[PDB]
Amino acid sequence: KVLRDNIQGITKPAIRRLARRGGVKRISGLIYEETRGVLKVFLENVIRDAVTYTEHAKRKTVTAMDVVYALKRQGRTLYGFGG
Amino acid sequence: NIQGITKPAIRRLARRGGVKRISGLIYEETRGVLKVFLENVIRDAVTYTEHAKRKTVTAMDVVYALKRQGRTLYGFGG
Amino acid sequence: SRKESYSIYVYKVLKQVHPDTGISSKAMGIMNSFVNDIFERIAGEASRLAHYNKRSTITSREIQTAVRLLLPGELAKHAVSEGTKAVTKYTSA
Amino acid sequence: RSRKESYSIYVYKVLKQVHPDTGISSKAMGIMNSFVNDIFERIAGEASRLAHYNKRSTITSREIQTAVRLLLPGELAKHAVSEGTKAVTKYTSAK
Amino acid sequence: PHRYRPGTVALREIRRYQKSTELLIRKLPFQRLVREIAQDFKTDLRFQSSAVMALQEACEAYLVGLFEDTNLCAIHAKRVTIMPKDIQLARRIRGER
Amino acid sequence: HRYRPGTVALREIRRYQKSTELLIRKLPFQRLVREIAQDFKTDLRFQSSAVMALQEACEAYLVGLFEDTNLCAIHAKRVTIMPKDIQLARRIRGERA
Amino acid sequence: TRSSRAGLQFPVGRVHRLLRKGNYSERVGAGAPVYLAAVLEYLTAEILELAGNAARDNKKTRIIPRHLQLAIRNDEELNKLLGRVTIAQGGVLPNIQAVLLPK
DNA sequence: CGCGTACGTGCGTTTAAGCGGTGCTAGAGCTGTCTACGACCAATTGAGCGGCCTCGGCACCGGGATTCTGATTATCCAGGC
DNA sequence: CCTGGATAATCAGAATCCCGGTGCCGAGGCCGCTCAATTGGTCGTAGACAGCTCTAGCACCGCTTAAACGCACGTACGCGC
């Protein structure tokens, strides 16, 4: 199955909840698009590293360890998924 | 000493950074920030020198201290 | 397949500091990742200074100055005291 | 007198290959040597991380290749991949 | 009837989502987004569910910290409503491109 | 005659942005470096190129901080930089907690 | 040597020695120093290329650190690579914000 | 201080998030055997860096001479009363 | 005829271009030693790769209802002055 427009699967109340957790009281209407793009700027910076790990391990399945090492490279290390 | 970083020196540092208008407390805040940054880098370099068993702080310890702090400097034996 | 971890050691330390307190699996994974991250950071710092001082070994002094460089002041000082007392009572015994 | 090694004549030769009527100062030469050493340390440490992650004790051309593909930006990494693979094949052909 | 003033429900949601730790983005749309993005880099790739969970945790933490810096910049801009220029200035100070 | 307040500042910006010379004098900064270094270890000597490296790194760091400070001041509807801009820049940068 | 055998100018010997002595792995392959020297050679070629271009733009026959700073910060990918890198005697790019300009 | 309105709020509607019962197989993982490429050691050799010498940029000082706005006073012209 | 703004000059300094010296240099190329790279040869084991097995990722299918969209209303917030 083809995958298209899944960036709009990140709904406006999800970005609202992420803003409420971040302490934002009032959110503009132009936020919910742009932050989504920043999420792409996050995700294309992360998985492109992890696939580069998965291409080196000669694997077709992206594991949790490749995501952990991709977060290790980006200076955004994560506890709870190995490493 | 800390006032040895003069107001025209911080003025020139702001002119290089593109600052048009400078407040009066900017010089003192820049002196404090420079003191904190110099304290961190010189502390790391002193740790390097006291592990190297030397009484002369070299430029290599300064380069390694800047490489530690994520502010890696090119041009002094990197 | 044996998967090595720091589970029983963190369990021993936790029962030493809090006897009526258990840990969850996610928090255990976080603690085990923290131990490996701190181990890798201190070992990489000691390897860096060993490469700097033209020396092919890593002794207690390199780990000591790596702890003094990485950890903040009170934490580094207490870890320095703990490391030195452990090295001395390993040397005597 | 200690015999300190550097990349002076090598970067000088690469400069003469890319710009015959251009020189370089020693203040720029120290920056170029520190740049070569920093890129060397970064790519070698990235190969070390990949070899440690993939439970392999051998750093081959593939480890340096994925280190370059991780560290360098896309067009720069692609051109460095082509240059590296070209030189590896030219080293493999000769003996 | 009853209708709360604007500004109370947002503060209550701030307190609620700062008290809790569960993921605010749903699992399946984010998983579809991750599969779409990774499909644009390499075709025929499988994903562990804990890998997508780690991606969700890291993305949610990064967006919460970005919203924190955005709210701080919007406060420094003499406002209470965040703007995309606040996001842009926070990413410029952070060094993100 | 008389110039407007702010034109000589722009001329100084255009002058110092094209130059590479260090804007802090060597002897007071060297005395400050030595005074800070005596607080960590007594009986220390300093190579001149070490002080030059410290001066170059500190001046570049202060120039980048003044860049982010001017960005914060422009975002705060001002043209004059302020210690609140420095505080917000060091807060988003992660230096100031 | 091995630099002439590979069509490169950078030494395979020095890179292969520093890969072994640098405590990087137990065994170090033979295709790795050729690849690393080629990547270093392309990177210094691009940097020296843009530095020579900046030196010709500044009407100078010798590359100064100002030309190296122009070559690094003017290119997007070279600035992205050397983002946390301070160049001594390099300075900054001439950049004045729009509100700073007079009316 | 005031103006205009954007985004806060609630409810009806609609959409698809989640559940947890089921089949499949593809690829991760364990294993087993052979080998070539990589370390190690020894003699050889030549590219590399110390020394030093010549030259090409090198420099911010200084007081005439060019030039580029800026405050400056004024002046003209078209529109409204 | 009065009056507000646009422009079209106006000289006037502040800054800028240009030439001359005392000044100390520092690039860059040759002489030459020398120790690390080269090369030949031997030991060995990490790993390549074809086998096996086996968890686990993917797809479907459908019960349930929490979650999201959008519309309507409006007040308090962004920004203009």
From Swiss-Prot, chain A:
Report what the Swiss-Prot or TrEMBL entry states about this protein's PTMs.
Acetylated as part of spermatogenesis progression prior to histone-to-protamine exchange. Demethylation is performed by JMJD6.
What happens when you mutate P13A? Answer: In TEBIVANED1
Residues bearing N6-succinyllysine? Answer: K12, K58, K60, K72
N6-(beta-hydroxybutyryl)lysine occurs at which residues?
K12, K58, K72
How the protein is affected by changing R26C? Answer: In TEBIVANED3
- N6-lactoyllysine found at: K12, K58, K72
Point out residues bearing the modification N6-butyryllysine. Answer: K12, K25, K58, K60, K72
Which positions bear Phosphotyrosine? Y32, Y69
Post-translational modification Phosphoserine, affected residues: S28
Could you tell me which cysteines form disulfide bridges?
A: none
Q: Positions modified as N6-propionyllysine?
A: K12, K25, K58, K60, K72
Q: Which residues carry this modification: N6-methyllysine?
A: K1
Modified positions (N6-acetyllysine) in chain numbering: K12, K72
Q: Which residues get modified to N6-(2-hydroxyisobutyryl)lysine?
A: K12, K25, K40, K58, K60, K72
Example of a GO MF term = structural constituent of chromatin
Sorted alphabetically, the Gene Ontology BP terms of this entry are:
chromatin organization; negative regulation of megakaryocyte differentiation; nucleosome assembly; protein localization to CENP-A containing chromatin; telomere organization
**Which residues, renumbered to this chain, carry the PTM N6-glutaryllysine?**
K12, K40, K58, K60, K72
Principal subcellular localization = nucleus
Tell me the domain of life: Eukaryota
Per the record, residues carrying N6,N6-dimethyllysine are: K1
How is this protein organized at the quaternary level?
Answer: The nucleosome is a histone octamer containing two molecules each of H2A, H2B, H3 and H4 assembled in one H3-H4 heterotetramer and two H2A-H2B heterodimers. The octamer wraps approximately 147 bp of DNA. Found in a co-chaperone complex with DNJC9, MCM2 and histone H3.3-H4 dimers. Within the complex, interacts with DNJC9 (via C-terminus); the interaction is direct. Interacts with NASP; NASP is a histone chaperone that stabilizes and maintains a soluble pool of Histone H3-H4 dimers.
Identify its protein family.
Belongs to the histone H4 family.
Name of the protein in question:
Histone H4
Species for this entry: Homo sapiens
Taxonomic lineage of this organism? Eukaryota, Metazoa, Chordata, Craniata, Vertebrata
* Gene name, Swiss-Prot/TrEMBL: H4C1
From Swiss-Prot, chain D:
Please give the residue positions where the record annotates the modification N6,N6,N6-trimethyllysine: K55
Q: Where in the cell is it found?
A: Nucleus; Chromosome
Modified positions (N6-glutaryllysine) are: K4, K13, K16, K78, K86, K90
Cellular component GO terms held in the UniProt record = CENP-A containing nucleosome; cytosol; extracellular space; nucleoplasm; nucleosome; nucleus
Can you provide one Gene Ontology molecular function annotated for this UniProt record?
A: DNA binding
Q: What is this protein called?
A: Histone H2B type 1-J
Residues bearing PTM Phosphothreonine:
T85
First and last residue shown, out of the full length, are 32 to 126 of 126
Q: Which residues carry this modification: N6-methylated lysine?
A: K86
Cite the entry's keywords alphabetically.
Answer: Acetylation, ADP-ribosylation, Antibiotic, Antimicrobial, Chromosome, DNA-binding, Glycoprotein, Hydroxylation, Isopeptide bond, Methylation, Nucleosome core, Nucleus, Phosphoprotein, Ubl conjugation
Organism of provenance: Homo sapiens (Human)
Tell me which residues bear N6-succinyllysine: K4, K86, K90
Chief location: nucleus
What are the N6-lactoyllysine sites (modified residues) in this protein? K13, K55, K78, K86, K90
Q: Which residues carry this modification: N6-(2-hydroxyisobutyryl)lysine?
A: K4, K13, K16, K27, K55, K78, K86, K90
Q: Which residues carry this modification: Phosphoserine?
A: S6
Q: Which GO terms describe its biological process?
A: antibacterial humoral response; antimicrobial humoral immune response mediated by antimicrobial peptide; chromatin organization; defense response to Gram-negative bacterium; defense response to Gram-positive bacterium; innate immune response in mucosa; killing of cells of another organism; negative regulation of tumor necrosis factor-mediated signaling pathway
Residues bearing PTM N6-acetyllysine: K55
From Swiss-Prot, chain E:
Q: Which residues carry this modification: Phosphoserine?
A: S20, S49
Subunit organization: The nucleosome is a histone octamer containing two molecules each of H2A, H2B, H3 and H4 assembled in one H3-H4 heterotetramer and two H2A-H2B heterodimers. The octamer wraps approximately 147 bp of DNA. Interacts with TONSL; CHAF1A; CHAF1B; MCM2 and DNAJC9. Interacts with NASP; NASP is a histone chaperone that stabilizes and maintains a soluble pool of Histone H3-H4 dimers.
Role this protein plays? Core component of nucleosome. Nucleosomes wrap and compact DNA into chromatin, limiting DNA accessibility to the cellular machineries which require DNA as a template. Histones thereby play a central role in transcription regulation, DNA repair, DNA replication and chromosomal stability. DNA accessibility is regulated via a complex set of post-translational modifications of histones, also called histone code, and nucleosome remodeling.
PTM sites of type Phosphothreonine: T43, T70
N6-crotonyllysine PTM positions: K19
Which lineage do the record's taxonomy fields give for this organism? Eukaryota, Metazoa, Chordata, Craniata, Vertebrata
N6-lactoyllysine, modified sites: K19, K42
One of its GO biological process terms is: telomere organization
Query: Where in this protein does the record say N6-(2-hydroxyisobutyryl)lysine is found?
Result: K19, K27, K42, K85
In the complete protein, the residues contained here run: 39 to 135 of 136
Species this chain originates from: Homo sapiens (Human)
The N6-glutaryllysine modification is found at K19, K42, K78, K85
Output this protein's name: Histone H3.1
| Family to which the UniProt record says this protein belongs | Belongs to the histone H3 family.
Curated annotation (Swiss-Prot), chain G:
* Localisation per UniProt entry: Nucleus; Chromosome
| PTM sites of type N6-glutaryllysine | K80, K103
Where are the N5-methylglutamine modifications? Q89
| One Gene Ontology term from the biological process aspect of the record | protein localization to CENP-A containing chromatin
Indicate the secretion signal residues: none
- Main location per the UniProt record: nucleus
Keyword Ribonucleoprotein belongs to the record:
no
| Gene Ontology CC terms, in alphabetical order | CENP-A containing nucleosome; extracellular exosome; nucleosome; nucleus
PTM sites of type N6-crotonyllysine: K21, K103
Q: Which residues are modified to N6-(2-hydroxyisobutyryl)lysine?
A: K21, K59, K60, K80, K103
Q: Which UniProt keywords apply?
A: Acetylation, Chromosome, Citrullination, DNA-binding, Hydroxylation, Isopeptide bond, Methylation, Nucleosome core, Nucleus, Phosphoprotein, Ubl conjugation
Q: Which GO terms describe its molecular function?
A: DNA binding; protein heterodimerization activity; structural constituent of chromatin
Residues with the modification N6-succinyllysine, per the entry, are: K80
Regions that span the bilayer: none
Q: How is it modified after translation?
A: It is involved in the initiation of both imprinted and random X inactivation. Ubiquitinated H2A is enriched in inactive X chromosome chromatin. Ubiquitination of H2A functions downstream of methylation of 'Lys-27' of histone H3 (H3K27me). H2AK119Ub by RNF2/RING2 can also be induced by ultraviolet and may be involved in DNA repair.
List N6-(beta-hydroxybutyryl)lysine occurrences by residue. K21, K80, K103
Assembly description: The nucleosome is a histone octamer containing two molecules each of H2A, H2B, H3 and H4 assembled in one H3-H4 heterotetramer and two H2A-H2B heterodimers. The octamer wraps approximately 147 bp of DNA.
Identify its protein family: Belongs to the histone H2A family.
Protein name per UniProt:
Histone H2A type 1-B/E
- The species this protein was found in: Homo sapiens
Mind giving the lineage of the organism this protein is from?
A: Eukaryota, Metazoa, Chordata, Craniata, Vertebrata
Q: Which gene encodes it?
A: H2AC4
Counting on the full-length protein, the chain here runs from 17 to 119 of 130
